[PDB]
Design a protein around this nucleic acid. Sequence first.
DNA 1: GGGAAGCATATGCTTCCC
DNA 2: GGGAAGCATATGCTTCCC
Lengths: 147, 147
Amino acid sequence: KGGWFGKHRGQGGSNPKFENIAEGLRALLARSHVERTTDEGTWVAGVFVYGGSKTSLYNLRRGTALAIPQCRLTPLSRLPFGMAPGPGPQPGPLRESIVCYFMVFLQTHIFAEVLKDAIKDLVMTKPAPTCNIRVTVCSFDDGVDLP
Amino acid sequence: KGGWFGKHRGQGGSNPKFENIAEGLRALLARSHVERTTDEGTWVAGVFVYGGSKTSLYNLRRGTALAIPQCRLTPLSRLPFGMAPGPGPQPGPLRESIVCYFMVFLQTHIFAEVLKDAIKDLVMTKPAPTCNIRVTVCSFDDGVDLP
DNA sequence: GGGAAGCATATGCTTCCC
DNA sequence: GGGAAGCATATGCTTCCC
């Protein structure tokens, strides 16, 4: 258990655990066959996913990759803190919490709203920490030119 | 040169290098003296910064921290690839590039729009790779509940 | 101020346990 | 399908180069 297997960052493949999550997402995405890709091929919309636990978000990230060939995903990363309570001292902009997040890039705003409804639906019937994963649609004013 | 200096992730302080960057950002933001915080204190918008090179983005990130105590910053992370041209297969949603990004969370959409302009203005006068840094405003439909 | 060094420690990945 | 182990290699952070 543990160690190196020869698979680098971003090289994760599929296994039954991730595929089960993918099949759950696919059944949910299938409630709305909306357009996922455009002629322009621009990444103008997204979905910001955060919370739950490190493993529950990681697992969601892996399953989404299998469920949607048309999206592009970031590695997991960390969120900074919000507003501290009171007229007291605020945390510095750079301070990081233990809470993770990841971003999903999509070509349409309509598909982004669908993915977001799928993730919230898939997670609402699960026990903590999974049920505590949060999601929001993100509109990029100028789009993101992914390399 | 190199090694441990007792400063953990998110603990960066200030030094003339980052203060110099901060001062340039400050002078630009001062022409547009808008509100940076709301009373509901919710994080509803952001500035998605990317490209350039790992160091120039990092330095911009540290300077932004000093210039804006009212914002919040994620660590640097990596961007997936985009669309391949042609009828063939596309890269997997998880594949990562060497290209970095970071996100600035803000309380108002007006201030994100102003912050974006200032960053584009700061960077456009400089040599490569810094002038290659890209910026876009991000609107969070349901906001982001920072820890 | 961009780039490199280099410790501490972050995630990406897999396989195993429950 | 959540949590952990544990190698490889990511960034955070500094000081020094230049």
